[PDB]
């Protein structure tokens, strides 16, 4: 009956669907372990090389950490994908016997048909019908004693005595994931145009429970992991660019990772090819997306949910475009209907390594200094000073002298413009070395000193803050200038403190905050289909034994 083949059907899925995902809940483990406790691990390296920077064996002791996190972020980019390819072939297999039992019914028809021209020839076809059940949503209907079978999304399986073939392939837009197809009556001279069946169409047996975990559950959980290795690299490799090394030059990358992957959908009929980048690496998008022009503007939908995530209508050539965090670029303007799968960090784990295995690499030291002149007689004290992105400093130092009779410092330089922190903010323009900088002892002043033209001209001091407090004597002197430096460790200590930054969930969460919760996705579907699971299993088990007691 219709109404057995519907809860068996449910029951395969979520069997089906609870295997592979207890499957890899049991891989991934505790969200405060594995990957989480390598991630914490290279940042308490850091605040060692913090202490010892010139030391060459805590440097190569933050290399192992690095070394033990690319392992573990690379090892399962491969279980991801050895999940994702596991998926593929049993959704061949599945097909295959799906094909199998097809057939059965379709000549089980004809059999029962000619016969009645058969109790045992009846059950024969109504297995057939249990084992197909198991493997897809199908409807059986009555049609002059005939079995006619159809999907639950309305494809015919068996119509009389012929048969339809499903077939597995690559998916049109994604090449590494098989999809379902029609590919018309069994046994045809050149079968029609294939037929895409939508996964989502395709629900019940085993080939809803494959295709659900495939889609709301694998695919998330390694976009969310490949998230967390990007905003990992991005981080480090910006904050080390602050940096100098042993020698005194800057910091350069520690990690790298492959850039977005992007397919043009197979349905296209354009032939525009697209590019894709984040807006802001620390923080990256950490679904998948598919990027569609209707001939009038471009939607980026998330693949996992279907939602729209944002639209644009460029009038630039070639076109360019953000959206959700990505900078998408065209290299024309598509034909409407086309469609690209844009995979911004599921590839991030495959490639993900050390840029450099070097101790020496670390950029620990900052590229400033500033400092008290040992002349002074006042209580005036400055800040060791600190850099930002895209910092310059000039060859020379510069030199700040206080002004007792005026209250103000003065030896910025030229063509600079110095914030000093409060609420508000002030800000001035350096037009010499005598223009003044208000400064109050009593207060004190947090002062960055930046270009005035941006981007910051070669030679021009940029991204470069010092704090002074209390009160210098009348000429008292300070000086900013590069680091020397050789032991310093301020950037090794901002480094170690990226692990407490929020560059995950639009700035709320850490890297291993964000790691907790991409295993807490994993772990909740488990529990959850694993009673839903047995309470179906066990309903199915119950309708079955009612109808094999009928009269």
Do not use: H
Not at 265 to 294: E, M, R
Not at 420 to 448: H, L, Q
Not at 516 to 531: E, F, R
């Amino acid at each position: 009956s219709n109404q057995l083949n519907a809860a068996q059907t449910q029951g395969s899925s979520l069997s089906t669907y609870y295997t592979l995902v207890a499957q890899l809940n049991n891989y991934v483990g505790s969200p405060t372990a594995g990957i989480a406790t390598a991630i914490t691990n290279y940042f308490t390296g850091l605040q060692t090389v913090a202490n010892n920077a010139a030391d060459p064996s805590a440097r190569q002791t933050a290399m192992s950490n690095a070394q033990t996190l690319a392992s573990q972020l690379v090892a399962a980019g491969q279980q991801y994908s050895q999940l994702r390819q596991s998926v593929n072939s049993q959704l061949t297999d599945t097909v295959t016997q799906i094909n199998s039992y097809t057939s059965q019914i379709a000549q089980l028809n004809e059999q029962i048909a000619s016969a009645s021209s058969p109790n045992q020839l009846l059950d024969q076809r109504d297995l057939a019908v249990s084992k197909l059940s198991q493997l897809a949503g199908v409807q059986v209907v009555q049609s002059n004693g005939n079995y006619s079978v159809f999907l639950s999304g309305g494809q015919p399986l068996v119509v009389g005595n012929a048969s339809y073939q499903l077939a597995t392939v690559a998916s049109p837009s994604d090449p590494s994931e098989l999809t379902i197809v029609s590919k018309g009556v069994a046994g045809s001279a050149q079968p029609g145009p294939t037929q895409y069946l939508p996964d989502v169409s395709l629900t019940g047996g085993a080939l809803g429970g494959l295709l659900a975990f495939r889609s709301q559950t694998l695919d998330p959980a390694q976009a969310q992991l490949g998230a967390l290795a990007v905003s990992f690299a991005s981080q480090v490799n910006a904050q080390n660019a602050l940096g100098v090394d042993m020698s005194g030059n800057p910091g350069g990358s520690l990690f790298a990772v492959g850039a977005p992957a992007v397919y043009a959908n197979q349905n296209n009929t354009g032939s525009a090819t697209l590019s894709v980048s984040f807006v802001d690496g620390t923080q990256p998008t950490t679904s998948d997306y598919a990027l569609s022009y209707d001939g009038a503007k471009y939607t980026l939908t998330d693949r996992a949910t279907g939602s729209v995530v944002g639209t644009a209508t460029p009038s630039s050539t070639p076109p360019t475009m953000t959206i959700g965090g990505l900078k998408l670029s065209l290299s024309s303007t598509p034909n409407a209907g086309d469609s690209f799968t844009v995979l911004p960090t599921r590839g991030a784990l495959d490639g993900f390594s050390l840029a450099t295995a070097n101790g020496s690499a670390i950029a620990a030291a900052s590229p400033v200094l500033a400092a008290g002149v040992a002349t002074n007689s006042g209580t005036g004290v400055i800040s060791q000073g600190s850099v930002s992105a895209g910092y310059q400093l000039p060859s020379g130092t510069t030199t700040l002298a206080y002004n007792a009779a005026s209250k103000t410092l003065s030896g910025f330089p030229v063509g600079t413009t110095v914030t000093i922190a409060g609420t508000p903010p002030t800000s001035i323009n350096i037009t010499s070395a005598t223009t003044p900088v208000p400064y109050d002892p009593s207060k004190g002043a947090s002062m960055t000193i930046s270009s005035t033209t941006q981007p910051a001209p070669s030679g021009v001091m940029n991204g470069v803050s010092v704090s002074l407090s209390g009160t210098p004597a009348d000429g008292d002197q300070f000086t900013i200038g590069a680091n020397k430096g050789t032991n310093d460790g301020r950037n090794a200590l901002a480094l170690s403190q990226l692990v407490n930054s929020k560059t995950m969930n639009n700035g709320t969460t850490t890297l291993t905050g964000a790691y907790a919760g991409y295993v807490n996705a994993i772990g909740n579907a488990a529990s959850q289909l694993k009673a839903s699971s047995a309470a179906q299993t066990a309903l199915v088990g119950q309708i079955t034994q009612a109808q094999q007691s009928v009269s």
